[model samples]
Target: ELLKPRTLADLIRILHELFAGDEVNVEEVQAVLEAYESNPAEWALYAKFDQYRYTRNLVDQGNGKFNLMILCWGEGHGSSIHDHTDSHCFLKLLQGNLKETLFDWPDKKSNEMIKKSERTLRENQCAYINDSIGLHRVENVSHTEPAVSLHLFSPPFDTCHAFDQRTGHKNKVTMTFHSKFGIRTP
Candidate 1:
């Protein structure tokens, strides 16, 4: 069994070492997300919640190979359909139940959203996506319970392309962070 990370730093150290060097494997990164997945209480120094918007709290912005952060989702809150800036992404549910709605942007000019699949991620469950998967959306399904998740991405993204189903518009957006080290950042 892997040694349980007693704290956020321990988890970050393990991942920082695993994701070292120029070469990075998607499965390995996913394994890191799984291995380090623990209760939010075990790693909440970097986490906080806001009802209006989900929070992306920085944990370790890797040696340029990846970025690790704790994403806290408020009840009834969710994200718009978006792509990962072509970066590999791994999501591990930490608290509450999260519903992820997947869609395929039919590669044509219209960028129409085609429903692909949907699922609820219970605590400790995970999902991963690469550039090949196209775009999707994530949300907290519960109306009263908030959710928390951990995300790992190679070359952490500062911006991503968002799709509007009604307008059929795809625009690049600057990502926002609620806090990093208990200090809020825009």
Candidate 2:
């Protein structure tokens, strides 16, 4: 049996080892995420919270093979409805609560999206998604408590489309990190 990690840094190191090859073993990664316990002290250094929106802090980029980040969501903050750009996205809820709403892939001509399903993830729970699964919007459902989640994206992508729920308008977004390797960025 593989040894469990004791800290966020240790977890990242393990992830690096896992992603060192040509292809990542997604199930193994998920198992690792599920086994890890939340450590607020270790994540706090990279947990940069923003008043207006959720913040993404880079932990490791995995040499262009994958990306690892810590996402902090203020109460009521959320992501716009977006796609994964064909990459596999996995997130492990570290603290507080988050709501993930899934939408059917937009109609090419109408650009309209149909609601599929959604669920609220609690602390230490893990979730996975990809373009094929559908588009999604992740929000902090709690009005009083903030939330934090650890995210991993394979075959890392920097650009994606953000869709408007009602009008179906699509906007491209370039992702950015609030910090890298525990260091705040400008």
TM-score of each: 0.89, 0.93
Task: Provide the overall lDDT of each model, using Cα atoms, as 2-decimal numbers.
Answer: 0.78, 0.88
Question: Against the true structure, whose TM-score is highest?
Answer: 2
Worst 10 residues of 2 by lDDT: 106-115
Q: For residues 65-133, what per-residue lDDT tens digits would candidate 2 score against the true structure?
A: 899899999999999999999898999999999999999777766655767898998899889899988
Clashes per candidate (backbone, < 3 Å): 0, 0
